[PDB]
Amino acid sequence: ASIAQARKLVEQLKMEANIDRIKVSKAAADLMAYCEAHAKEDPLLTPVPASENPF
Amino acid sequence: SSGALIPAIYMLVFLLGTTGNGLVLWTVFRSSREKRRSADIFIASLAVADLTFVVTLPLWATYTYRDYDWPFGTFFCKLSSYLIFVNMYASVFCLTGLSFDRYLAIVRPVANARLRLRVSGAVATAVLWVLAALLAMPVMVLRTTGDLENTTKVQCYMDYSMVATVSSEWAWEVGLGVSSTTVGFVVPFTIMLTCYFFIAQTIAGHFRKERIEGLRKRRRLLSIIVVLVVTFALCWMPYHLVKTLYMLGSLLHWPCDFDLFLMNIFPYCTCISYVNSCLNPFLYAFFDPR
Amino acid sequence: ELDQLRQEAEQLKNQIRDARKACADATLSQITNNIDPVGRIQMRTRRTLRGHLAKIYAMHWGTDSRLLVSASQDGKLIIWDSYTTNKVHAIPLRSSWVMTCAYAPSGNYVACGGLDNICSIYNLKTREGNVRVSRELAGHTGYLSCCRFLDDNQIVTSSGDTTCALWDIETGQQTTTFTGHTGDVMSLSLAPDTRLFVSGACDASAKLWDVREGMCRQTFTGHESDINAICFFPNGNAFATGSDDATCRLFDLRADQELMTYSHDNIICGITSVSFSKSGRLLLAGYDDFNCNVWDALKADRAGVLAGHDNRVSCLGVTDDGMAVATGSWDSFLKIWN
Amino acid sequence: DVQLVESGGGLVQPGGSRKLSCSASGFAFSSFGMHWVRQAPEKGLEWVAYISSGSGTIYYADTVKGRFTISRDDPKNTLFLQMTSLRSEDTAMYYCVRSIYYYGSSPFDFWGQGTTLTVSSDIVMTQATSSVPVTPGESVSISCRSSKSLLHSNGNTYLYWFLQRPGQSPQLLIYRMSNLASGVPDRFSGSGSGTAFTLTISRLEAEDVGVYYCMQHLEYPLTFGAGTKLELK
Amino acid sequence: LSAEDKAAVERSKMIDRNLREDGEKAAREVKLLLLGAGESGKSTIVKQMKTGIVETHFTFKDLHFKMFDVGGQRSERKKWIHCFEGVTAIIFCVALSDYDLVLMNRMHESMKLFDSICNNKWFTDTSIILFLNKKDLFEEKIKKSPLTICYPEYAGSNTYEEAAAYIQCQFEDLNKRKDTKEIYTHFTCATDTKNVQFVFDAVTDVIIKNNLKDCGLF
Ligand SMILES: COc1cccc(OC)c1-n1c(NS(=O)(=O)[C@@H](C)[C@H](O)c2ncc(C)cn2)nnc1-c1cccc(C)n1
């Protein structure tokens, strides 16, 4: 029984090994830019009193 | 006889009752509302009826040392009498409602109690107060005030005028008595007797099991369920007792020797009638460990 | 036979850890410390729903940001109207043990399930005029944790023992079953592209699946206890994980790292749910300390505290438009905040 | 599948009394509300009575306030309508109707078959057009006007449309402005606003010949129009 | 409002009435839970009462019951155990014929399971009904084997009553909370429609005690 899971795991990490990686600075700048570019579309950060609030 | 200690006994009763009721109301207020049971609403009604029954005490306490001189105008003592009587009626009625809830919840958990939303659906806490206020409307202002032809002592009291007929004055007053006092004295006490008799027979028929440690709890349960009514009776009897004695004596040819005795003892029983309400917070300082 | 394993497994894990360790030049706080704080945010309770009679275990928002679905521990499943607090439907379940409700992306189907090992699908729009069970899904061995819709014909489920499955609805037969976990699987979220999704195990691990093929592409670690909730970033390149270690974490897909850890010294309870807000600036997290904290995304600073419940909060979500926030508890109430 | 059958009616002397009945067939009768709609020999479509779910709200018409009674019994799945004093303006088919009301419901879904009797302020929809020649393969438009603007504060209009081919029962086409119904081809469009409403078709076939009607649902007294015949020369 | 809004609120009120009726109907039924160790007398216990979770349904003397069984769940127990907070009692089956079978003493595994279920933080205000299933096997098994193999610290002869008392008291000892909950420990193999009577007595006693603690002076 252990023989099957042995291969099932070894091939799993073998497939895991070959992955292209991106650098943390650029990856975090991407989320920063996306979060900054939609500030006006957030109804929870900056609300509106009565014109467009169904609740 | 001709004692001036009643202001001091009034002060001590006020202190004890106010402390106990403030403690119990703070304990029941410091908790949330929805997590509670269905009995602490009646408990809080009892607490407010106890507090309001006592807040007015110092006025009538100093009424003795001032020796029948009323300094607070006209409406103050009539509202005082209204509040004290509605408080006494409300206290008796809310204890009655609490026992009614206990009956409907404990007698048969399966056969009855399908009317829990009917009787305990927060309707008692309104109907009891409404009935107390309605019955206290004559107690609201039927009172009068004044002096004598030469007596400068200013006291306020219940109006005996009712000029409709001289022979109907005492008749209507004794009717008021033997209606209000009689119903408030017999209906609650009889329903308490029936309720606790049924509870006792149920708990005696369902606890036949001869166990080791639960017999102490069964004995304690029966002891508490008997001493509750024992204290209620032996601490509330003399009030209605002396009023009944006076009303039965008055319409009869009776020797006036004990008139002094009854008049002397009448204001004394007031203190123990007060302490009957004053030991109510003990009923949950001892039997409620929350 | 295990002698080769006891070296190859370690060599492979070292060769997969060294690169991701050597690609960690900086952090999120160090780069995003210059942005201004979001300021204290206050949210009031707008509408409270008073229908249930037991615990509430699940909640989901429809696509139109108006309808709602709840599944209580009693045999009921109520569909609400979030604008006027009415009731449009009430479904009596066959089994009284439910742990997930799901709403179709179109508005015609509702799915539920629980300890009964089955996932029932109900049909709402019917000529007769009542909800009728359409298909009873079978093939699992443990309790049913969470289910989600892709379209009106496919559904992804998260079983109890190890498995997560994809089957079509016309035929009650599993289409693809992928197993790589060791322990229970509780939560899963679907990416907007509908081609990828992640699931959270109970052995402190989260994996990224592929809907088409059925293999596991990536794995992440880091928590010291089980994971109870996952929600994607709105963009589709990150997800947040809740744990019973009293902490949340944010991972990145292309980076294969953990960015920031959201944990305070005052909190010691567990986390029951997590969901992002629009634009990915706020992170609402349910807590077992009778509260619902609001966190910042690019900073660790805590925003306001959302506290209006008498029991623990179990499920919460944010509408597609981004206006309302819904929370449910083990009390009978379901609150809507704004 | 869904079937409403109603029967019982003959000749009545001017002052007599008779009772109608309609029987359901498997559509969860207890969860819907039912109506009654009248139609003189060659006239429009009036309104008669109403009964709601749970036998709660019961609203009548104006002309029949004091001589009609409506009742239902959930067992046996049947509906009744009594008559007391009938004059010469009660000769019509009575067209039992179905209705359901929730957030995304479709009122006036299924219409019955009809019986026959021969005794022998409010919104006014004009629909000034009476008859227009039509030819297959092109687009035609029908217009309707109302006394009051129907745009409520909720943001949704309340005015419907109907079709009736010669020799059968009406059916629903669009259950608001711009909300197409189920079981109807998608060659229809509402495109209405304010008080001037319209309805255009893509192509005209041989099955679309008939009469088209209008109906308002703001004020409870439901008024109708007059009709627009298509002749298809 | 419009006519449709009034119709919608009428529908909502009708649904609320129906839900209240359903809750009131379902609020007066006893709920139980059977937990066992491996292959125990649960199979023969469920007999005289009349996939995963299995529901059993029977009534007795104007009282309505509802019994569950989660033996075949096979998952992490601490994770799905939340849902059973409102149960009235917890029936428990323990095999007396497994004191010599080993698979690691079987009876010791049962003791550990009883410990974990009894001291769990959820079921702190609920009673426990303990069934000792096998009687006839015990009589023929004590005469040939020494009980010291199951608990060496015991001192005594090889009769029946002392052994039964020792087993019962050792099972009852693990209950740390002496005051809040009570154990009953009835034997079996005398089913004879008597087990349902024992369950009825236990449930009526626990419900009257719960009512007394909830509203009474307790
Ligand atoms: C605030 O109250 C009073 C204060 C002072 C004197 C009073 O009475 C003499 C009361 N009082 C009253 N007056 S009285 O009865 O009309 C009295 C004037 C009448 O001469 C009478 N009646 C009965 C006998 C035996 C003799 N003489 N009636 N009730 C109460 C009451 C008392 C305590 C608590 C409560 C709730 N109530």
PDB file of N, CA, C and O in Angstrom, chain D residues 78-131:
ATOM      1  N   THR D  78     -61.721  23.544  -5.231  1.00  0.00           N
ATOM      2  CA  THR D  78     -62.809  24.115  -6.011  1.00  0.00           C
ATOM      3  C   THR D  78     -63.044  25.554  -5.563  1.00  0.00           C
ATOM      4  O   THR D  78     -62.733  25.930  -4.432  1.00  0.00           O
ATOM      5  N   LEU D  79     -63.585  26.364  -6.475  1.00  0.00           N
ATOM      6  CA  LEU D  79     -63.887  27.764  -6.209  1.00  0.00           C
ATOM      7  C   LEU D  79     -65.304  28.069  -6.677  1.00  0.00           C
ATOM      8  O   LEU D  79     -65.769  27.501  -7.670  1.00  0.00           O
ATOM      9  N   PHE D  80     -65.989  28.965  -5.963  1.00  0.00           N
ATOM     10  CA  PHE D  80     -67.385  29.279  -6.231  1.00  0.00           C
ATOM     11  C   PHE D  80     -67.588  30.784  -6.345  1.00  0.00           C
ATOM     12  O   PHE D  80     -66.751  31.583  -5.918  1.00  0.00           O
ATOM     13  N   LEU D  81     -68.729  31.158  -6.924  1.00  0.00           N
ATOM     14  CA  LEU D  81     -69.151  32.553  -7.010  1.00  0.00           C
ATOM     15  C   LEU D  81     -70.668  32.586  -7.107  1.00  0.00           C
ATOM     16  O   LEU D  81     -71.232  32.116  -8.100  1.00  0.00           O
ATOM     17  N   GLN D  82     -71.321  33.139  -6.090  1.00  0.00           N
ATOM     18  CA  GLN D  82     -72.774  33.150  -6.018  1.00  0.00           C
ATOM     19  C   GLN D  82     -73.348  34.390  -6.690  1.00  0.00           C
ATOM     20  O   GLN D  82     -72.660  35.398  -6.877  1.00  0.00           O
ATOM     21  N   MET D  83     -74.623  34.304  -7.055  1.00  0.00           N
ATOM     22  CA  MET D  83     -75.348  35.402  -7.674  1.00  0.00           C
ATOM     23  C   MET D  83     -76.712  35.534  -7.011  1.00  0.00           C
ATOM     24  O   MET D  83     -77.344  34.528  -6.679  1.00  0.00           O
ATOM     25  N   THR D  84     -77.161  36.773  -6.808  1.00  0.00           N
ATOM     26  CA  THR D  84     -78.440  37.022  -6.150  1.00  0.00           C
ATOM     27  C   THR D  84     -79.454  37.682  -7.075  1.00  0.00           C
ATOM     28  O   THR D  84     -80.542  37.135  -7.276  1.00  0.00           O
ATOM     29  N   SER D  85     -79.133  38.840  -7.650  1.00  0.00           N
ATOM     30  CA  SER D  85     -80.072  39.596  -8.480  1.00  0.00           C
ATOM     31  C   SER D  85     -79.354  39.993  -9.764  1.00  0.00           C
ATOM     32  O   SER D  85     -78.412  40.789  -9.735  1.00  0.00           O
ATOM     33  N   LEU D  86     -79.807  39.446 -10.888  1.00  0.00           N
ATOM     34  CA  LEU D  86     -79.152  39.629 -12.175  1.00  0.00           C
ATOM     35  C   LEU D  86     -80.048  40.413 -13.119  1.00  0.00           C
ATOM     36  O   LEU D  86     -81.214  40.055 -13.316  1.00  0.00           O
ATOM     37  N   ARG D  87     -79.500  41.470 -13.701  1.00  0.00           N
ATOM     38  CA  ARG D  87     -80.151  42.233 -14.753  1.00  0.00           C
ATOM     39  C   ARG D  87     -79.574  41.822 -16.103  1.00  0.00           C
ATOM     40  O   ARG D  87     -78.776  40.888 -16.207  1.00  0.00           O
ATOM     41  N   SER D  88     -79.978  42.537 -17.145  1.00  0.00           N
ATOM     42  CA  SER D  88     -79.623  42.146 -18.508  1.00  0.00           C
ATOM     43  C   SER D  88     -78.181  42.440 -18.861  1.00  0.00           C
ATOM     44  O   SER D  88     -77.840  42.347 -20.047  1.00  0.00           O
ATOM     45  N   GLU D  89     -77.318  42.786 -17.912  1.00  0.00           N
ATOM     46  CA  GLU D  89     -75.914  43.065 -18.182  1.00  0.00           C
ATOM     47  C   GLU D  89     -75.017  42.053 -17.478  1.00  0.00           C
ATOM     48  O   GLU D  89     -73.988  42.402 -16.900  1.00  0.00           O
ATOM     49  N   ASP D  90     -75.403  40.780 -17.520  1.00  0.00           N
ATOM     50  CA  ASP D  90     -74.652  39.700 -16.893  1.00  0.00           C
ATOM     51  C   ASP D  90     -74.560  38.492 -17.816  1.00  0.00           C
ATOM     52  O   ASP D  90     -74.558  37.343 -17.365  1.00  0.00           O
ATOM     53  N   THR D  91     -74.479  38.730 -19.122  1.00  0.00           N
ATOM     54  CA  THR D  91     -74.344  37.668 -20.116  1.00  0.00           C
ATOM     55  C   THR D  91     -72.909  37.675 -20.620  1.00  0.00           C
ATOM     56  O   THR D  91     -72.526  38.559 -21.394  1.00  0.00           O
ATOM     57  N   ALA D  92     -72.121  36.688 -20.199  1.00  0.00           N
ATOM     58  CA  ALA D  92     -70.694  36.715 -20.492  1.00  0.00           C
ATOM     59  C   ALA D  92     -70.061  35.377 -20.136  1.00  0.00           C
ATOM     60  O   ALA D  92     -70.655  34.545 -19.444  1.00  0.00           O
ATOM     61  N   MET D  93     -68.838  35.189 -20.624  1.00  0.00           N
ATOM     62  CA  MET D  93     -67.951  34.116 -20.202  1.00  0.00           C
ATOM     63  C   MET D  93     -67.104  34.620 -19.042  1.00  0.00           C
ATOM     64  O   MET D  93     -66.663  35.773 -19.036  1.00  0.00           O
ATOM     65  N   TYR D  94     -66.876  33.759 -18.052  1.00  0.00           N
ATOM     66  CA  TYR D  94     -66.389  34.244 -16.770  1.00  0.00           C
ATOM     67  C   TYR D  94     -64.946  33.881 -16.438  1.00  0.00           C
ATOM     68  O   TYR D  94     -64.460  34.299 -15.380  1.00  0.00           O
ATOM     69  N   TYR D  95     -64.256  33.117 -17.288  1.00  0.00           N
ATOM     70  CA  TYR D  95     -62.796  33.150 -17.380  1.00  0.00           C
ATOM     71  C   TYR D  95     -62.054  33.141 -16.047  1.00  0.00           C
ATOM     72  O   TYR D  95     -61.471  34.158 -15.664  1.00  0.00           O
ATOM     73  N   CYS D  96     -62.097  32.030 -15.317  1.00  0.00           N
ATOM     74  CA  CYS D  96     -61.336  31.915 -14.077  1.00  0.00           C
ATOM     75  C   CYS D  96     -59.844  32.116 -14.338  1.00  0.00           C
ATOM     76  O   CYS D  96     -59.299  31.613 -15.324  1.00  0.00           O
ATOM     77  N   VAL D  97     -59.182  32.860 -13.447  1.00  0.00           N
ATOM     78  CA  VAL D  97     -57.793  33.273 -13.634  1.00  0.00           C
ATOM     79  C   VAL D  97     -56.973  32.888 -12.407  1.00  0.00           C
ATOM     80  O   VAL D  97     -57.498  32.766 -11.296  1.00  0.00           O
ATOM     81  N   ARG D  98     -55.673  32.697 -12.620  1.00  0.00           N
ATOM     82  CA  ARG D  98     -54.696  32.364 -11.594  1.00  0.00           C
ATOM     83  C   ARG D  98     -53.780  33.555 -11.337  1.00  0.00           C
ATOM     84  O   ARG D  98     -53.643  34.448 -12.177  1.00  0.00           O
ATOM     85  N   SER D  99     -53.140  33.562 -10.167  1.00  0.00           N
ATOM     86  CA  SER D  99     -52.246  34.660  -9.816  1.00  0.00           C
ATOM     87  C   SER D  99     -51.395  34.276  -8.615  1.00  0.00           C
ATOM     88  O   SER D  99     -51.887  33.645  -7.679  1.00  0.00           O
ATOM     89  N   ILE D 100     -50.122  34.671  -8.653  1.00  0.00           N
ATOM     90  CA  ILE D 100     -49.192  34.507  -7.543  1.00  0.00           C
ATOM     91  C   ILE D 100     -48.412  35.807  -7.385  1.00  0.00           C
ATOM     92  O   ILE D 100     -48.181  36.533  -8.357  1.00  0.00           O
ATOM     93  N   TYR D 101     -48.018  36.111  -6.149  1.00  0.00           N
ATOM     94  CA  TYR D 101     -47.399  37.393  -5.825  1.00  0.00           C
ATOM     95  C   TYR D 101     -46.189  37.181  -4.925  1.00  0.00           C
ATOM     96  O   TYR D 101     -46.341  36.843  -3.746  1.00  0.00           O
ATOM     97  N   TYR D 102     -44.995  37.381  -5.471  1.00  0.00           N
ATOM     98  CA  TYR D 102     -43.792  37.560  -4.664  1.00  0.00           C
ATOM     99  C   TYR D 102     -42.826  38.425  -5.468  1.00  0.00           C
ATOM    100  O   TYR D 102     -43.232  39.100  -6.418  1.00  0.00           O
ATOM    101  N   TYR D 103     -41.548  38.417  -5.080  1.00  0.00           N
ATOM    102  CA  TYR D 103     -40.598  39.368  -5.653  1.00  0.00           C
ATOM    103  C   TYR D 103     -40.449  39.190  -7.159  1.00  0.00           C
ATOM    104  O   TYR D 103     -40.425  40.174  -7.907  1.00  0.00           O
ATOM    105  N   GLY D 104     -40.347  37.949  -7.625  1.00  0.00           N
ATOM    106  CA  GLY D 104     -40.172  37.711  -9.044  1.00  0.00           C
ATOM    107  C   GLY D 104     -41.306  36.934  -9.673  1.00  0.00           C
ATOM    108  O   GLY D 104     -41.097  36.174 -10.622  1.00  0.00           O
ATOM    109  N   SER D 105     -42.518  37.118  -9.157  1.00  0.00           N
ATOM    110  CA  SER D 105     -43.657  36.342  -9.614  1.00  0.00           C
ATOM    111  C   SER D 105     -44.158  36.863 -10.957  1.00  0.00           C
ATOM    112  O   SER D 105     -43.670  37.859 -11.498  1.00  0.00           O
ATOM    113  N   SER D 106     -45.153  36.170 -11.501  1.00  0.00           N
ATOM    114  CA  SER D 106     -45.759  36.521 -12.784  1.00  0.00           C
ATOM    115  C   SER D 106     -47.269  36.430 -12.647  1.00  0.00           C
ATOM    116  O   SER D 106     -47.876  35.390 -12.931  1.00  0.00           O
ATOM    117  N   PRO D 107     -47.915  37.506 -12.199  1.00  0.00           N
ATOM    118  CA  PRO D 107     -49.369  37.472 -12.020  1.00  0.00           C
ATOM    119  C   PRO D 107     -50.092  37.258 -13.340  1.00  0.00           C
ATOM    120  O   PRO D 107     -49.604  37.633 -14.406  1.00  0.00           O
ATOM    121  N   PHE D 108     -51.269  36.633 -13.250  1.00  0.00           N
ATOM    122  CA  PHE D 108     -52.118  36.351 -14.409  1.00  0.00           C
ATOM    123  C   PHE D 108     -51.427  35.401 -15.383  1.00  0.00           C
ATOM    124  O   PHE D 108     -51.335  35.660 -16.584  1.00  0.00           O
ATOM    125  N   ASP D 109     -50.952  34.274 -14.854  1.00  0.00           N
ATOM    126  CA  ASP D 109     -50.194  33.330 -15.668  1.00  0.00           C
ATOM    127  C   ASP D 109     -51.137  32.499 -16.532  1.00  0.00           C
ATOM    128  O   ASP D 109     -51.067  32.545 -17.765  1.00  0.00           O
ATOM    129  N   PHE D 110     -52.027  31.738 -15.905  1.00  0.00           N
ATOM    130  CA  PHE D 110     -52.869  30.774 -16.603  1.00  0.00           C
ATOM    131  C   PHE D 110     -54.315  31.246 -16.568  1.00  0.00           C
ATOM    132  O   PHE D 110     -54.817  31.649 -15.514  1.00  0.00           O
ATOM    133  N   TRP D 111     -54.977  31.190 -17.718  1.00  0.00           N
ATOM    134  CA  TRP D 111     -56.383  31.539 -17.843  1.00  0.00           C
ATOM    135  C   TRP D 111     -57.191  30.292 -18.172  1.00  0.00           C
ATOM    136  O   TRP D 111     -56.743  29.435 -18.939  1.00  0.00           O
ATOM    137  N   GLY D 112     -58.387  30.200 -17.599  1.00  0.00           N
ATOM    138  CA  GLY D 112     -59.202  29.009 -17.732  1.00  0.00           C
ATOM    139  C   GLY D 112     -59.850  28.842 -19.091  1.00  0.00           C
ATOM    140  O   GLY D 112     -59.278  29.232 -20.111  1.00  0.00           O
ATOM    141  N   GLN D 113     -61.044  28.254 -19.120  1.00  0.00           N
ATOM    142  CA  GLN D 113     -61.748  27.991 -20.368  1.00  0.00           C
ATOM    143  C   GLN D 113     -62.999  28.840 -20.527  1.00  0.00           C
ATOM    144  O   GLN D 113     -63.136  29.547 -21.531  1.00  0.00           O
ATOM    145  N   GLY D 114     -63.919  28.791 -19.567  1.00  0.00           N
ATOM    146  CA  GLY D 114     -65.078  29.661 -19.603  1.00  0.00           C
ATOM    147  C   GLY D 114     -66.414  28.952 -19.631  1.00  0.00           C
ATOM    148  O   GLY D 114     -66.536  27.849 -20.170  1.00  0.00           O
ATOM    149  N   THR D 115     -67.426  29.587 -19.049  1.00  0.00           N
ATOM    150  CA  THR D 115     -68.808  29.136 -19.086  1.00  0.00           C
ATOM    151  C   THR D 115     -69.637  30.192 -19.814  1.00  0.00           C
ATOM    152  O   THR D 115     -69.100  31.158 -20.360  1.00  0.00           O
ATOM    153  N   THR D 116     -70.954  30.011 -19.826  1.00  0.00           N
ATOM    154  CA  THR D 116     -71.815  30.935 -20.553  1.00  0.00           C
ATOM    155  C   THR D 116     -73.117  31.135 -19.794  1.00  0.00           C
ATOM    156  O   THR D 116     -73.739  30.163 -19.359  1.00  0.00           O
ATOM    157  N   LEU D 117     -73.518  32.394 -19.642  1.00  0.00           N
ATOM    158  CA  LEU D 117     -74.787  32.759 -19.033  1.00  0.00           C
ATOM    159  C   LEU D 117     -75.550  33.670 -19.980  1.00  0.00           C
ATOM    160  O   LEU D 117     -74.962  34.552 -20.612  1.00  0.00           O
ATOM    161  N   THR D 118     -76.859  33.447 -20.087  1.00  0.00           N
ATOM    162  CA  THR D 118     -77.739  34.258 -20.927  1.00  0.00           C
ATOM    163  C   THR D 118     -78.983  34.599 -20.114  1.00  0.00           C
ATOM    164  O   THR D 118     -79.965  33.851 -20.134  1.00  0.00           O
ATOM    165  N   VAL D 119     -78.946  35.724 -19.398  1.00  0.00           N
ATOM    166  CA  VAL D 119     -80.101  36.119 -18.597  1.00  0.00           C
ATOM    167  C   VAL D 119     -81.251  36.566 -19.494  1.00  0.00           C
ATOM    168  O   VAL D 119     -82.425  36.393 -19.148  1.00  0.00           O
ATOM    169  N   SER D 120     -80.932  37.141 -20.653  1.00  0.00           N
ATOM    170  CA  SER D 120     -81.931  37.617 -21.611  1.00  0.00           C
ATOM    171  C   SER D 120     -82.943  38.559 -20.967  1.00  0.00           C
ATOM    172  O   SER D 120     -84.073  38.166 -20.679  1.00  0.00           O
ATOM    173  N   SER D 121     -61.562  59.491 -11.450  1.00  0.00           N
ATOM    174  CA  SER D 121     -61.830  58.463 -10.452  1.00  0.00           C
ATOM    175  C   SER D 121     -60.820  57.323 -10.561  1.00  0.00           C
ATOM    176  O   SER D 121     -59.871  57.245  -9.782  1.00  0.00           O
ATOM    177  N   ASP D 122     -61.033  56.443 -11.534  1.00  0.00           N
ATOM    178  CA  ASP D 122     -60.155  55.314 -11.792  1.00  0.00           C
ATOM    179  C   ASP D 122     -59.401  55.527 -13.097  1.00  0.00           C
ATOM    180  O   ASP D 122     -59.770  56.368 -13.922  1.00  0.00           O
ATOM    181  N   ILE D 123     -58.327  54.754 -13.274  1.00  0.00           N
ATOM    182  CA  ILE D 123     -57.521  54.886 -14.479  1.00  0.00           C
ATOM    183  C   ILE D 123     -58.351  54.460 -15.686  1.00  0.00           C
ATOM    184  O   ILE D 123     -59.148  53.517 -15.622  1.00  0.00           O
ATOM    185  N   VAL D 124     -58.174  55.175 -16.794  1.00  0.00           N
ATOM    186  CA  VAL D 124     -58.858  54.864 -18.043  1.00  0.00           C
ATOM    187  C   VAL D 124     -57.797  54.723 -19.125  1.00  0.00           C
ATOM    188  O   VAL D 124     -57.210  55.722 -19.555  1.00  0.00           O
ATOM    189  N   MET D 125     -57.549  53.492 -19.566  1.00  0.00           N
ATOM    190  CA  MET D 125     -56.679  53.252 -20.707  1.00  0.00           C
ATOM    191  C   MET D 125     -57.474  53.466 -21.986  1.00  0.00           C
ATOM    192  O   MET D 125     -58.541  52.870 -22.168  1.00  0.00           O
ATOM    193  N   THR D 126     -56.955  54.314 -22.869  1.00  0.00           N
ATOM    194  CA  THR D 126     -57.696  54.668 -24.074  1.00  0.00           C
ATOM    195  C   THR D 126     -57.541  53.604 -25.154  1.00  0.00           C
ATOM    196  O   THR D 126     -58.520  52.966 -25.556  1.00  0.00           O
ATOM    197  N   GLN D 127     -56.312  53.388 -25.619  1.00  0.00           N
ATOM    198  CA  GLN D 127     -56.027  52.501 -26.743  1.00  0.00           C
ATOM    199  C   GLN D 127     -56.930  52.853 -27.928  1.00  0.00           C
ATOM    200  O   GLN D 127     -57.822  52.102 -28.326  1.00  0.00           O
ATOM    201  N   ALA D 128     -56.695  54.053 -28.463  1.00  0.00           N
ATOM    202  CA  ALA D 128     -57.596  54.626 -29.460  1.00  0.00           C
ATOM    203  C   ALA D 128     -57.665  53.784 -30.726  1.00  0.00           C
ATOM    204  O   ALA D 128     -58.693  53.785 -31.412  1.00  0.00           O
ATOM    205  N   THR D 129     -56.592  53.073 -31.060  1.00  0.00           N
ATOM    206  CA  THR D 129     -56.595  52.250 -32.259  1.00  0.00           C
ATOM    207  C   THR D 129     -57.603  51.115 -32.126  1.00  0.00           C
ATOM    208  O   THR D 129     -57.812  50.567 -31.040  1.00  0.00           O
ATOM    209  N   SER D 130     -58.258  50.786 -33.239  1.00  0.00           N
ATOM    210  CA  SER D 130     -59.265  49.732 -33.260  1.00  0.00           C
ATOM    211  C   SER D 130     -58.845  48.560 -34.134  1.00  0.00           C
ATOM    212  O   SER D 130     -58.811  47.422 -33.657  1.00  0.00           O
ATOM    213  N   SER D 131     -58.521  48.802 -35.402  1.00  0.00           N
ATOM    214  CA  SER D 131     -58.114  47.745 -36.315  1.00  0.00           C
ATOM    215  C   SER D 131     -57.103  48.298 -37.306  1.00  0.00           C
ATOM    216  O   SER D 131     -57.266  49.412 -37.811  1.00  0.00           O
TER     217      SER D 131
END
